[PDB]
Amino acid sequence: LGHMRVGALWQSNANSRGLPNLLKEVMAAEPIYPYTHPGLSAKQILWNTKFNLKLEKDLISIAESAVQSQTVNKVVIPTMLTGDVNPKSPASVVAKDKYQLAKQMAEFQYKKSYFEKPWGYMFAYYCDEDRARLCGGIGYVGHHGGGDAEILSYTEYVSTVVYPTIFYMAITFVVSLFLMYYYIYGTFFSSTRNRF
Amino acid sequence: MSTNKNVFFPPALHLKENSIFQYKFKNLAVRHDAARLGIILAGPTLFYWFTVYYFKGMPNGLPPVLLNPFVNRNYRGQKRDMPWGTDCAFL
Amino acid sequence: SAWNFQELMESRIPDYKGRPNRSGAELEQVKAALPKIEFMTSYEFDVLTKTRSNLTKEYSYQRDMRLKVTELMLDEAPHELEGLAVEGDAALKQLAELKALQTLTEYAGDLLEGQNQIVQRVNDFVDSNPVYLLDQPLREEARWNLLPEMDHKTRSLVRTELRDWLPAEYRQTRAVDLQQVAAFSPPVKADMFRAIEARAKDAEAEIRSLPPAEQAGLLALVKDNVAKSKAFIDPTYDITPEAINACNDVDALRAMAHRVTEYSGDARLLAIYGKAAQLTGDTAAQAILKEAKDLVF
Amino acid sequence: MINNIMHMINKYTLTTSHKIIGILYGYMGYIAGILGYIISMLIRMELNTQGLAIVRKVKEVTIYNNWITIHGLIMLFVFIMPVGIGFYGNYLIPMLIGTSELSMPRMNGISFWMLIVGVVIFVISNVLMSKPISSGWTLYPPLSTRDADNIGVNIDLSLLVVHVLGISSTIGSVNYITTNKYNRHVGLTFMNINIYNFSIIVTSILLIGSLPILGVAITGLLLDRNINSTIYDVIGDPVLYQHLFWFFGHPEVYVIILPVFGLTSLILTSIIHKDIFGREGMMYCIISIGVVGYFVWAHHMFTVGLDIDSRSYFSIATSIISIPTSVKMFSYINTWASGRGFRGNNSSWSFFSFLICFCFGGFTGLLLSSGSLDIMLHDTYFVVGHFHTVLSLAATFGLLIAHYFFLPIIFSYSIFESFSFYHTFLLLVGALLVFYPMHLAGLSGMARRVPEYADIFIPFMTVGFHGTFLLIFSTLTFIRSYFQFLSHINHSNYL
Amino acid sequence: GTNPGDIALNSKRFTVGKFVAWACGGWGLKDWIFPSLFIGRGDGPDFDRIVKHTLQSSSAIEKVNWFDSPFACYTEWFVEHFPGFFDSRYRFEMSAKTILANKYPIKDFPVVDMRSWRSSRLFDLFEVPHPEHTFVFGGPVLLNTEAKRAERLEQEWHGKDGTFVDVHPLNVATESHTEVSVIGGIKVYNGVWQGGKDSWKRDSAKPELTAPFHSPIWYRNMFIVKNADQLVEHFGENLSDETWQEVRKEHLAFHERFHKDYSFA
Amino acid sequence: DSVHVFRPEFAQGKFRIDLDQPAKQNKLQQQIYTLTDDEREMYEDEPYIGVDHLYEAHKGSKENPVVVEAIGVHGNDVFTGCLGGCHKDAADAVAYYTIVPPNTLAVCIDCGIHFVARINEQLTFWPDGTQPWEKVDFKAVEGFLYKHYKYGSPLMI
Amino acid sequence: LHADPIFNGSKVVRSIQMMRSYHRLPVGPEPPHLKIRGAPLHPWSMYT
Amino acid sequence: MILNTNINYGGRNSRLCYLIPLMVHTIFLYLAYLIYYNINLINIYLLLIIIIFI
Ligand code: HEA
Ligand code: HEA
Ligand SMILES: CCCCCCCCCCCCCCCCCC(=O)OC[C@H](COP(=O)(O)OCCN)OC(=O)CCCCCCCCCCCCCCCCC
Ligand SMILES: [Cu+2]
Ligand SMILES: [Zn+2]
């Protein structure tokens, strides 16, 4: 029977490969708490965790008891079209007045400094890593494409490539017809020469 | 829950007709199929036998066909060994 | 008729008709029967139904599982973080302890994900076989229709019954929002603050019963935790009527009005806007505020 | 190891998995291609040298006639269809529409093993037995029934081989249509399935409609030979046989060609990193070619004695069929434009060779469509040039594109591009030297199916000699490349 | 992508393997007599190029956690075939760290592997050799099944009225909601429990058990899927287009000293 | 007056699975059709409904992604796909396919759309006539689910 | 301290070994395909 | 319980994948023998019994 597996727990087979843990791939052998919990030792982290856990338990109990024993004076029922499962989202994602524009601008600047540029650099590294993986004679890397490839839009390509090509082809067609007819028969319009 | 219930103990349905058979012959398609069958049974079949009754004591005067002339009795000297082994028709 | 190329169900094309046609009599009867209705601006519904504290919208049982796993992991921390030995100074020992703690939490984190996956699989089973988990007459409506296509009443009854089929600890109900309940009720906010202060005081005593360096470190941590907890429950606990009265800046009152509108939009808006109008002499604004305090609040 | 041996034999005989049946079809197709190539080399060596240098006797030219007939049959019915339709058809069709198996899983295995039965009967009949069938690949009576060199039973065995191959093809065709019509995954309409599936569907429709007629013709031949009837005798209608056979004959040709179009389109989408230019246009052109191929069958009988009106009609219909193929060629040329096809890929260069050779072969065959001009070109070497610069340079190169594109995917080892470049280029140059001269030897009057020719035709056969040597080199390179494909290193040191 | 196996038994002048190769394919007299032209440099790791690429690197080689990751066993292949490897890897790791050190409560990390490439033909998505049994549990599911259908055209094709498609009765009832809450004395009805499509948010993330409740930290690995032929990327809210163009220019300006002295021939 | 009883369908297995919950299995197997060129022309000139797309987050935002539920084995990668052209720079000649981990948030960066695949397994009672004819409780189901989650259950092939 | 395997577990690595889309063309910020006389060939070129 | 697969017919291995081809081979070689030696190799009724049985 060979090596029979026991239990149907997860194995990284061809169909299932799982969700990569980039945090462990990057932070290999380096602790995460220097970045997530700056300036704290393990004992302080544990003490803080226990304190916050008890506080959160108390707050949750109070909130549940509050919601469970409150009289109802108003009933709110949102308006939805029949055949709709949930109401539309009342919220919006567009700044309306100038103050919201300033707030959105500040948030975007922070996010660009801390979230978007890291994403861009990680994606660039990923592209280059894939190129290196498909190199060395395994894949078709370097056969075509690159930074020197000339990329044209649809309009530009049709106008500056396709039409002149067809124009030259038409010129070639007429010229070849005339020159071939003269080449064989020897006359442009009188069929065979010296025969008619 | 599963439809197996009605597989095991299907409902029993009351009919006004004396039998299910008649109930199925109030549908136009079955009536027209029965009409086609009756037409075929009535006209041709009864007629055909009538003819063998009407011409029971009369001969067949059709002129026989001409298959093989005498001068072609050898069939042009063509091999005719059938796969059975002898130059005779399977019949 | 000699061939049959059917399917399980013909595709169902919805008929639209339109909005109901009610004459004067029917419209009059409908209007008479309906209660007193206060039509709410979409902003009111938004601030009511925002996602504030329950960021990931986790169900109650998921939160309970996470807290229990945290308790268990805390219980087992001393064993793992005991007897660690590594060549190096205090910093190397500290980083070794941090790494051991990270390994423990990752070990405990993977168990929580496994249990969540198991409960979610049980629920996936619940919705996978509704015909076998419902009584008449809802069983036929579950058999012949999908969720979107059901009648509203039958849809709601079917979903509630399916959820009730599960044990108590597998039912999927969104967890409570602490910030939400605090925002929409004064007494609960005061109770939460009192509880925060009581826990902080108890922890401060416990700290006072410890050797010196730990005392300073954990006191700093307690102060930071109290400040951030107060911010978490209600970011606008410093916008008090006294603060509004002491404020004499149009820009500051505008910022306070923004922050109150974001949070709850309660009568502090009336106070701030009244004071801003007084400093600016806006009779139309004062009239609108009078209307608001008569009707809105 | 008895259990292991029997398990392997059960794996490759009881199977119904489309992937396994596909690889089996591919293997049989490649083997039969090599056998046909060997016989072709024999034929060429007979032609190149003067004085019946191989058979040595006029009485024994029946050996050469047997060679040409088995070359034709092997290369048509066991090389292209098993590879073009059997191999990629089974391996890819279920995958490209997102489903597990073909409909009728058992009929797939039945099809493959019917093919193997036919190959076995053919190989035994035409090798181990004496005085084999020697009547050209178009088994024209009364030569194939009332002759002196065709009397043995093995001739009847070859006819039955044709029967079994027909049965296998019909089963495969029905299976492909059925699987493509009902098992498509949700959200995929019939005309959104990729190009290859559609071409396979139309090919299957072609095979279904014509094979029964070929079966009738072959049963007629068998009855004439055995029970001594007179369907195709001096008092029969050999022209009737020709009509039936060629009613099957041209649909077979388009069945051969269309799947190559589908495969080339798919591979192009995969290697130029761009969609097909006018995909709907190509699909409609494919179905048009399929439909129009059923009305042109008698352009292969312009000298039989057909009525003058029928001659004109069939020239017209052949031109009609010529149109949509031109549309497809233009679509290909525009597809390659603006794309980023790999500049150093044997697939790319084989596509170029396929395009050029198919255009040239289509033109040469469009000359032959005219009834009048077919007076001077029927049964000369112009027809041989035509259908070898189409079959052996457009169908073969399309299959080379597929071979060099799907080897890494199936086996998971990349391809030795320099080796493949040598193979493909020498195959191109050698083949052109063999067949191109044939064209100008047909306009000069050289008849076909002759082992001995007049002295006026020496230059063409010298160029053919050159081409045959280059072909031997290319095929050895190809086989050795494949052997090297599945073999680990043989040298390794320290630098 | 080749493991030589045992160098000892393949370096001999005469071997069973070499004779078999000669007989069937892969070896011949041209290899014995002329090894400079037919074996030549051969295929293997290049120590000289590895040393050059290592010495061209900046201090990013010291500060990178690469050597302890599970990919440390691929170090030489990437160092040789990825010019400027360590600088790019250091930027990637610092990007991950700065994402981790944000103020947001959910940290999204991009993930790109062999599965991150879309294709118009299904056989391109399987690992080679293909599994024996494919699509056992049905074929692909299209995202478009969760978009609203073309109601107007659907009504038109059937000849139905299709006049009031865009106007529907309003539904304001307490029997149409199952998710009832109480919020400060106000009983709010909102939403219906649909099923596993309402729990996507929590299952996508994993908590940090030591993070306090008043500052949660959740880790999320966002998968990235790209066509690989589009040439234009649109990340959505993750990365704005202007930022992406800026990153393009910066990457190609800094990673130009590891690419300038080589020719593509 | 007569009593007639229609002959029931005795088949079990996949037939009974498909007749027990026809809506779900139909949803699995029922085809839906894309638009022809005429309909594309008549659709691209259709008007929006109200001023809502200007403010609300679209279907496919990082907060409101497109959720697609497939069937299979828990943990197996999910096959999904776009029909092309979601963004004006994304090709739309033919459908484009994807293979994505089961329950993660993925982003089509050709179109910038956030989606969430998810596999829900089809665990059903053995179709041999011993199916529950009335509401069943969690006990026996608990046992079967435990056995499956620990060791797995056969496939209905 | 090692838990039951799960697909999103802490110990799951990126799939860079097993090839899936063999015939793709990597795309992104890439250097110009410069050509020089005598310089060593670039790793990412069709020539070796 | 049982994990349910797609709606297609999964496919089973069977001996009909080669028995039918062997039956065709048998019929055709039997006909060849009858053509050559004019006598059946085995009884026609036995052959039909085999064909029916398969
Ligand atoms: C697909 C069909 C096919 C193929 C591939 C070929 C291949 C070749 N054929 Fe022929 N041929 C016919 C179909 C084909 N032929 C037919 C139908 C006839 C008429 C029979 C008759 O007239 O009755 C005929 C007749 C015919 C004659 C007739 C002689 C005479 O009538 O006077 C000659 C002689 O020159 C000839 C030569 C060749 C040569 C030299 C090759 C090749 O050597 C050149 C190309 C070689 C290749 C290398 C292909 C070999 C394939 C493999 C290498 C498999 C490898 C795998 C793949 C690449 C997929 N062929
Ligand atoms: C293998 C595939 C294949 C293909 C695709 C074709 C395609 C065509 N074939 Fe032929 N043919 C054979 C295989 C094929 N053939 C074989 C094997 C034989 C011999 C059987 C034997 O006798 O043993 C044969 C024999 C044969 C004959 C026999 C001549 C004779 O025996 O008397 C004729 C003559 O009518 C003919 C015609 C054509 C025509 C008109 C096309 C057309 O389809 C070609 C169309 C192609 C194009 C037209 C190219 C596109 C052109 C352009 C890009 C634009 C130009 C267009 C215009 C100006 C209109 N073929
Ligand atoms: C189970 C299904 C069928 C299986 C078939 C298997 C065999 C395949 C071979 C196909 C064709 C075989 C042809 C050989 C039969 C020759 C028949 C023959 O000799 O015909 C003559 C006979 C009429 O004789 P006649 O001269 O008119 O009589 C004078 C007074 N009545 O006329 C006849 O007897 C005509 C008989 C019909 C025509 C043949 C068509 C096929 C039907 C099968 C018949 C039996 C086949 C016997 C083959 C033996 C080997 C298996
Ligand atoms: Cu033809
Ligand atoms: Zn997309």
Mutate to test the pocket of ligand 3, among H24, H31, H36 (most ligand atoms within 8 A of CB): H31
Q: Which residues, in sequence order, are CB contacts of A58 under 8 Å at separation 6+?
A: C195, C199
Angstrom distance (rounded) from CA D58 to CA A52:
107
Would you say the CB of residue D389 lies under 6 angstroms from ligand 2?
no
Return the H-helix or E-strand segment holding C258.
helix C250-263
* Sign, CA torsion D464/D466/D468/D471: negative
Angstrom distance (rounded) from CA D165 to CA D212:
12
Strand order in the sheet with H2-4: F123-124, H2-4, F155-156
Looking at chain H, the residues that come just before a C–N gap of over 2.5 A are none
Angstrom distance (rounded) from CA C118 to CA F146:
9
Q: List the structure tokens of C172.
A: 């999927």
Please, which residues 13-52 of chain H have a Cβ atom closer than 8 Å to chain E?
none
The coordinates were experimentally obtained by: cryo-EM
Q: Are D490 and E21 in contact (CB under 8 A)?
A: yes
Residue C63 has φ and ψ, to the nearest 5°, of -65, -40
Q: Are C245 and C275 in contact (CB under 8 A)?
A: yes
**What distance lies between CA D16 and its chain's CA centroid?**
26
D300 annotated ligand-binding residue: yes
Q: Are C268 and C244 in contact (CB under 8 A)?
A: yes
Q: List the structure tokens of F28.
A: 């699995």
What is the bridge-based pairing of β-strands E180-183 and E186-189?
Answer: antiparallel
DSSP category for residue E102: S
Cβ within 8 Å, pair A137-D414: yes
Length of chain C counted residue by residue = 297
* Sign, CA torsion G20/G25/G26/G28: negative
Angstrom distance (rounded) from CA A6 to CA F105:
32
DSSP category for residue D373: G
What is the bridge-based pairing of β-strands F105-108 and F2-4?
Answer: unpaired
Q: Are D214 and D167 in contact (CB under 8 A)?
A: no
Angstrom distance (rounded) from CA D181 to CA D198:
10
What is the bridge-based pairing of β-strands A80-81 and E170-171?
Answer: antiparallel
Token pair 């093809």 is found at D169
Q: DSSP letters along chain G, please?
A: --PPP-TT-TT-----SS-S-TT----SS-------SSPPBPTTSS--
Q: Which residues, in sequence order, are CB contacts of F116 under 8 Å at separation 6+?
A: E200, E204, F65, F66, F67, F68, F103, F104, F105, F106
Angstrom distance (rounded) from CA E51 to CA E45:
11
Q: Are E128 and G22 in contact (CB under 8 A)?
A: yes
Helix H, strand E, coil C: the string for F81-129 is EECCCCCCCCCCCCCEEEEECCCCEEEECCCCEEEEEEECCCEECCCCC
What is the bridge-based pairing of β-strands B13-15 and F2-4?
Answer: antiparallel
Would you say the CB of residue D378 lies under 6 angstroms from ligand 2?
yes
Q: List the structure tokens of A155.
A: 């309009």
Would you say the CB of residue D33 lies under 6 angstroms from ligand 1?
yes
Q: What are the Cα distances from residue E114, in Å, to C68, E119, E202, F143?
A: 38, 12, 26, 39
CA dihedral D267, D270, D271, D274 (to 10 degrees): 120
C292 burial class (0-12, 13-18, 19+ CB within 10 angstroms)? middle
Question: Rounded to the nearest whole angstrom, what is the distance from the C-alpha of residue D38 to the centroid of ligand 4?
Answer: 27
Q: What are the Cα distances from residue F38, in Å, to C61, D456, F86?
A: 52, 63, 19
Cβ within 8 Å, pair H3-F18: no
Would you say the CB of residue D31 lies under 6 angstroms from ligand 1?
no
Question: Rounded to the nearest whole angstrom, what is the distance from the C-alpha of residue D363 to the centroid of ligand 1?
Answer: 20
Nearest atom in ligand 3 to the alpha carbon of residue B89 is: 19
Q: Are F133 and B5 in contact (CB under 8 A)?
A: yes
Whether the link from the prior residue into D142 is cis, omega within 30° of 0, is yes
Residue C96 has φ and ψ, to the nearest 5°, of -65, -40
A 10 A CB-CB count for C4 gives 5
Q: List the structure tokens of B3.
A: 């439809």
Q: Which residues of D touch B83 (CB under 8 A)?
A: 226-227
Cβ within 8 Å, pair D340-G25: yes
Provide the β-strand partners of residue F78: F100
Q: Are A136 and E81 in contact (CB under 8 A)?
A: yes
Cβ within 8 Å, pair D340-A139: no
* D366 three-class SS: helix
The amino acid that residue C3 corresponds to is W
* E180 three-class SS: strand
Angstrom distance (rounded) from CA E109 to CA E204:
12
DSSP category for residue D144: T
Q: Which residues of B touch D228 (CB under 8 A)?
A: 78-82
The amino acid that residue C247 corresponds to is C
Q: How far does E136 lie from chain H, in Å, by closest CA?
A: 6
Residue E218 has φ and ψ, to the nearest 5°, of -120, 140
* E173-184 exposure pattern, b = at least 16 Cβ within 10 A, e = fewer: eeebbbbebbbb
* E211 three-class SS: coil
Q: Which residues, by Cβ under 5 Å, contact ligand 4, an ion?
A: D 250
Q: Are D495 and E12 in contact (CB under 8 A)?
A: no
Please, which residues 20-79 of chain E have a Cβ atom closer than 8 Å to chain A?
43, 65, 68-71, 77-78
A 10 A CB-CB count for D229 gives 14
CA dihedral C212, C213, C214, C220 (to 10 degrees): 110
G25 burial class (0-12, 13-18, 19+ CB within 10 angstroms)? buried
Region label for D352, one of left (φ > 0), alpha (ψ between -120 and 50) or beta (otherwise): alpha
Within chain A, residue ranges assigned H as helices are: 22-26, 33-36, 42-68, 98-111, 117-133, 154-157, 163-185
* Sign, CA torsion D27/D31/D32/D36: positive
Would you say the CB of residue D374 lies under 6 angstroms from ligand 2?
yes
The candidate with the shortest Cα–Cα distance to E217, out of E97, E106, E98, E103, is E106
Q: Which residues, in sequence order, are CB contacts of D87 under 8 Å at separation 6+?
A: D22, D23, D25, D26, D29
Token pair 């930027």 is found at E91
Cβ within 8 Å, pair C125-F145: yes
Angstrom distance (rounded) from CA A42 to CA E119:
48
D379 annotated ligand-binding residue: yes
Angstrom distance (rounded) from CA C129 to CA F17:
10
Q: What are the Cα distances from residue A51, in Å, to C107, C174, G3?
A: 22, 25, 27
